[PDB]
Design a protein around this ligand. Structure first.
Ligand SMILES: *[C@@H]1O[C@H](CO)[C@@H](O[C@@H]2O[C@H](CO)[C@@H](O[C@@H]3O[C@H](CO)[C@@H](O)[C@H](O[C@H]4O[C@H](CO)[C@@H](O)[C@H](O)[C@@H]4O)[C@@H]3O[C@@H]3OC[C@@H](O)[C@H](O)[C@H]3O)[C@H](O)[C@H]2NC(C)=O)[C@H](O[C@@H]2O[C@@H](C)[C@@H](O)[C@@H](O)[C@@H]2O)[C@H]1NC(C)=O
Ligand SMILES: *[C@@H]1O[C@H](CO)[C@@H](O[C@@H]2O[C@H](CO)[C@@H](O)[C@H](O)[C@H]2NC(C)=O)[C@H](O)[C@H]1NC(C)=O
Ligand SMILES: CC(=O)N[C@@H]1[C@@H](O)[C@H](O[C@@H]2O[C@H](CO)[C@H](O)[C@H](O)[C@H]2O)[C@@H](CO)O[C@H]1O
Ligand SMILES: CC(=O)N[C@@H]1[C@@H](O)[C@H](O[C@@H]2O[C@H](CO)[C@H](O)[C@H](O)[C@H]2O)[C@@H](CO)O[C@H]1O
Ligand code: CA
Ligand code: CA
Ligand code: MN
Ligand code: MN
Ligand code: NA
Lengths: 239, 239
């Protein structure tokens, strides 16, 4: 078995287990701010930021045909403090090719380049999308499962609990090809679920980077916080 | 689309939208005690109780071949007051042929009559299993997805938060055939997930009853409470 795992119950500035990209900072109090917070505490528009675990992850091996099962968990808050215009754009857990740099922002969430469906992306993602783009369902926020496209293969509306912490569980079972995600708000007790078939052998490269990305919007004050308080991950590739 | 749904935020005695079977009772405080609680407040062993919603559910159609999607949610608690003997046996949400009566108790949970994998059972169930029988994985408690057999096709160990309230979400999406179940403990924030492919056409009759069942064990003090505080359900059959 090729097993890999990590776990941050909080973040600490400077620990090179994490590559920070774009606007992402780790505060002194241990919070990963994916998108820029101005000095008055308000979230800035036109901001993109990501973080990746600095170690590659073996997900499948094109010599044995085995596929790795895996699971990630994290806690985040999105606060939408502006009365106008509508908030944007969201945050996302993603798995893609290694050594990746941030892509386009706004509705592509720092992960995609366009609204194309394109096997060249080689990227799996679970999004928490706060702005309804032309390729989106009308309901926001929504969870979505993104396979080689910002146009999710499956979505699920959820109600924001503005500024509260949400717990996320994301799990892939290789044998059934099921990818599931759950969002829980302790503040309210609300529980949301989503699941779809995903053949990661046909999507992901053998090795992948895993990461979190956030983005705010393309006009002034179309913005929200994308703060992350903890992040764990476990992958296990059978022989 | 053919639609049915219900939602009990608490339970009220004498309401005949619910059928109580075996030991099941509704207290004056709105709690559904699936298995018997003695006058001294301790749970009684050798006890089996169930509740069924009193309207059948149209889950699929042989002529059109359409299959309903559905979701159920409930809050329960299991209190295990003794450490010797081991507590038993558990509770379960189940879907099966109409007009059914309690089957065997103990590790069969009031739903099955023995351990065989038999298509004549015509029963689908999500179990919360507290005692490790010969057909069970060694870890208890565990969530299990039971398709025509108390021998689960898929299990997920979880840690009991003894005596505290758990929140369950179970969802079936017809197009993917994914059956998913989530357990959340608000007291601790723990989250557990389980999912598997189920084709309910090969499993269930076209019309089913839905219900809840609990059972305590086969020797003195091998017992635990099986209390349920709320229960909702929704199904939608395309047309
Ligand atoms: C777990 O075991 C339980 C106990 O066995 C099952 O419940 C019993 O299920 C049987 C049906 O298989 C019920 O018996 C029938 O009762 C009806 C109504 O009176 C009779 O008409 C019927 O008899 C006819 O069919 C028989 C063959 O099935 C023929 O042999 C017979 O000639 C008739 O043509 C049958 O009655 C029995 O006939 C044989 C006699 O020797 C016997 O004495 C007589 O009872 C039975 O009433 C029922 N018991 C209870 C407490 O409910 C249970 O089955 C599930 O629920 C029942 C109601 C049905 O819906 C089953 O399809 C269903 O599986 C089973 N539970 C599970 C999940 O397997
Ligand atoms: C997404 O955008 C990036 C940047 O434009 C693309 O990456 C460049 O792609 C070409 C060919 O793949 C390379 O020559 C460049 O060196 C790449 N730049 C970097 C930083 O890697 C990427 O290919 C685009 N992907 C899609 C699907 O459009
Ligand atoms: C001033 C103005 O109307 N600008 C709009 C952009 O806002 C808009 O881009 C979108 O902006 C929203 C937030 O408002 C969000 O960030 C979307 O992801 C982003 O695409 C654009 C739409 O094509 O039109 C501009 O004129
Ligand atoms: C006295 C004694 O050991 N009796 C045992 C039964 O307890 C046992 O049944 C199992 O008991 C546990 C709880 O103790 C649980 O209820 C199981 O579901 C049940 O099957 C049985 C096992 O074959 O043997 C008796 O002798
Ligand atoms: Ca969007
Ligand atoms: Ca058992
Ligand atoms: Mn979206
Ligand atoms: Mn079991
Ligand atoms: Na309690």
């Amino acid at each position: 078995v090729e097993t890999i795992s990590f776990s941050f119950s909080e973040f600490e500035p400077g620990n090179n287990d994490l590559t920070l990209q774009g606007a992402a900072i780790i505060t002194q109090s241990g919070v990963l701010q994916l998108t820029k917070i101005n000095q008055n505490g308000m979230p800035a528009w036109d901001s993109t930021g990501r973080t990746l675990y600095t170690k590659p992850v073996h997900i499948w091996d094109m010599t044995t045909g085995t596929v790795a099962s895996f699971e990630t968990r994290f806690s985040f808050s999105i606060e939408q403090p502006y009365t106008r215009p509508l908030p944007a754009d969201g945050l996302v857990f993603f798995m893609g090719p290694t050594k990746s740099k941030p892509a386009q922002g706004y509705g592509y969430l720092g992960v995609f380049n366009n609204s194309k469906q394109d096997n060249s992306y080689q990227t799996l993602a679970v999004e928490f999308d706060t702005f309804s783009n032309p390729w989106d369902p009308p309901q926001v926020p929504h969870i979505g499962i993104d396979v080689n496209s910002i146009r999710s293969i499956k979505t699920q509306p959820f109600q924001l609990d503005n500024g509260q912490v949400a717990n996320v569980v994301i799990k892939y079972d290789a044998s059934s090809k099921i990818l599931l995600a759950v969002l829980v708000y302790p503040s309210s007790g609300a529980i949301y679920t989503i699941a779809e078939i995903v053949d990661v052998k046909q999507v992901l490269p053998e090795w992948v980077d895993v990461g979190l990305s956030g983005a705010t919007g393309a006009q002034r004050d179309a913005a929200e916080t994308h703060d992350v308080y903890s992040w764990s991950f476990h992958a296990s590739l059978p022989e």
